Every structure is written in C-alpha cells, then in structure tokens.
C-alpha cells in the first residue's frame, strides 16, 4: 500500500504538472510569447523555431488526459 500510494502521488504530481504548465504558459512562453493571440486551441506554430508541436494549452489538456487515465488505472 505504501508503494502504490507513492505511485498515486507520482500520477497526481505529473498530471497536475502537465495541467499547471499548460495553464501558466497558455498566455505565452519563449517559443510563442504571444500564444494568447492564437487562442486556447490551435494546431501549432510550425516547424520553425525548432518545432512547435503540441504548443497550445489544449495540447496540455490532451497530454494530461493520458496521465489522468493512468492515475485512475
């Protein structure tokens, strides 16, 4: 039970990290300092500046869904 409660702690911490990082960078970061101008959900910003796949906060939601399902598992 100790080991599995630490697994649950990992799951919660990681899912919340995804969600919080997505919400706090939703207005912008150093790849997209104007990410708020594009909206909550957009495909990306292109391969330029190194590649920008899964940049929006919606992509953070979609990532966090996997870890949430894993935590509930």
């Amino acid at each position: 039970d100790f080991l599995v409660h630490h697994a649950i702690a990992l799951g919660l911490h990681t899912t919340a990290l995804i969600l919080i990082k997505g919400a706090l960078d939703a207005r912008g970061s150093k790849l997209m300092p104007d990410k708020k101008d594009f909206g909550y959900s957009f495909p990306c910003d292109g391969p330029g500046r190194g590649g920008t796949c899964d940049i929006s906060a919606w992509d953070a939601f979609y990532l966090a869904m996997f870890w949430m399902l894993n935590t509930l598992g």
Partner: protein, 80 residues
C-alpha cells in the same frame, strides 16, 4: 483565409518573400530600417499557412506572423 501581419520590427531582408511558395508577400518601400523596405501581404487569399515566411525570419521573435483563419480550397491546398 489566413492573416499575414508585418510589424515595425522588420529589417527588410526579403527572406520571407523568397521563402513563400504561393506569392503572398511583397517588398514595399519603407523608412523604418536600413534596407528602407518592409514586408507586405497583398495576396492573402492564396496563403495556405505553411509558416515558411516565419521560418525564414531573423528578428528575435518574428516580425511577420501568420494566423490561420477560415479555410477554403486555396488555403487547404486542394487540387480538386
């Protein structure tokens, strides 16, 4: 169609026009940089949104920005 805006941080290196694959951008005269020119987006109805103009931009964060809007045959790049 997509919006292609240009800002005052333009240095007029003409790279985004050279990188455009659908002739959306032009080099018009200006007085805000050394090259005495600025980028423009007259033919935005032919923009597909490939972000190449942004990729070829040198300014610290782009001076030219592409915002994907209402999709059409031309923007979706359809040959049918």
């Amino acid at each position: 169609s997509h919006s292609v805006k240009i800002y005052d941080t333009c240095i007029g290196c003409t790279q985004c026009v050279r990188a455009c694959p659908l002739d959306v951008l032009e080099m018009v005269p200006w007085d805000g940089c050394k090259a005495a020119q600025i980028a423009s987006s007259p033919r935005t109805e032919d923009c597909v949104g490939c972000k190449r103009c942004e990729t070829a931009c040198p300014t610290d964060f782009l001076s030219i920005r592409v915002y994907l809007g209402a999709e059409t045959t031309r923007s979706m790049g359809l040959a049918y």
